[PDB]
């Protein structure tokens, strides 16, 4: 059911099995990179313990990372059964295309993982560099949904820890800052009532 769907929830406690299988998984997780963050974070084991393996049989994983999440995210990415096969970097600019620890950071990283044998994808249509203007902080550019749609068009995609601006067609956004539940694929609406007769 092509249009946007989403589920406000805690991603730690949500039975993801009801949701089926996806050609692409994307997550921009609120990593505990210390620094007493202004948002709620997941601890390393909570990230480790997420139920990613039940989401895909053959497809790609997209995982934003920063700071120590570069090594951790690689851990989670292998622990979940993926192989890091690419790594996109987003170069942050301003409205006139100039760039915004030890070095000042001009980019943010996004590990690309694969699982199983995926077939039908148009690998190699985009390159691994995104150049886009920073909107709000903590956000991530819209261009990645273009790259992902070209990669695997018309297929089911799931986002984890999505915020409301993340809701896109062909996609299902999960996250704790969303407006309730909005489900249109009947197979999902059925497995959801079966598992959650009275909401969660």
């Amino acid at each position: 059911l092509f249009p946007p769907q989403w589920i406000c929830c805690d991603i730690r406690y949500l039975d993801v099995s009801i949701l089926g299988k996806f050609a692409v998984v994307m997550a921009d997780p609120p990593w505990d990179i210390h620094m007493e963050l202004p948002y709620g974070t997941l601890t390393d084991d909570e990230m480790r313990r997420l139920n990613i393996p039940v989401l895909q049989d053959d497809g790609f994983l997209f995982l934003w990372v920063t700071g120590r999440a570069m090594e951790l995210g690689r851990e989670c990415l292998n622990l979940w059964g993926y192989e890091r096969v690419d790594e996109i970097i987003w170069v942050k600019t301003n409205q006139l295309q100039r760039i915004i620890h030890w070095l000042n950071h001009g980019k943010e990283h996004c590990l690309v993982g694969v699982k199983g044998n995926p077939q039908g994808f148009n690998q190699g249509l985009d390159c691994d560099v995104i150049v886009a203007e920073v909107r709000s902080t903590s956000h991530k550019p819209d261009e990645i949904y273009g790259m992902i749609e070209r990669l695997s068009p018309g297929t089911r995609k799931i986002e984890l820890f999505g915020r409301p601006h993340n809701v896109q067609p062909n996609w299902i956004t999960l996250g704790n800052q969303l407006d309730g539940i909005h489900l249109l694929d009947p197979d999902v609406v059925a497995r959801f009532k079966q598992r959650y007769p009275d909401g969660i």
Binding site: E71, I99, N104, H105, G124, V129, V131
Partner: protein
Amino acid sequence: NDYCQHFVDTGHRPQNFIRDELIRLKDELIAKSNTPPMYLQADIEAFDIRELTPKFDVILLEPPLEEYYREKCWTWDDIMKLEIDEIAAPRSFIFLWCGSGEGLDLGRVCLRKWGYRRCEDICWIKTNKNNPKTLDPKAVFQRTKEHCLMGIKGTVDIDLIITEEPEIGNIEKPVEIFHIIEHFCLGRRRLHLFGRDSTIRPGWLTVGPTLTNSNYNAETYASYFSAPNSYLTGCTEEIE
């Protein structure tokens, strides 16, 4: 403007369209503080690395990856077998080139094996303005960059170098990496492993198999850092 869309349409990588106080003093301070350049031909596989002394403040590591020759290649197997920790100083740094393949993972294993924590991930992003190819089997996207990993052990610049892509079969890494290293002021014992004749540089020691001449002598090399020079950052006025 969607520049990923543009690349899909026109062949121009999104990095093609990135546009572009005076810290010139801390440049003449490096230039005066630099030791005379020192170099040494060596087959680093066959070569006992401990014979390189004293312990280095900075190690720059540029091993020849198979992927550099799309058109001897060290595997990450060979690289990880290197005994880096034996010549690195208690407090020291490392800059490791990792390409864009398995090296982005395997090189982090190296970093931890030699006892460093990654603090900085430096990206050489290659513009193709002069010519709008092959993909790795497992590659999802066109690879248009290389990564240089930064590691520390013990207790001004940006993390991006943008240059045009080098001609096929040219393998130099941009000299901007040296500027970024030197502006950190990390010490004066600087080792460039797998450098070439063209990478020799004042302030550095270059060890590599393709070097055509040598002038290394551990005693002479140590004489540049005996007191009262043992601790200089590389960014200070010389002592008389």
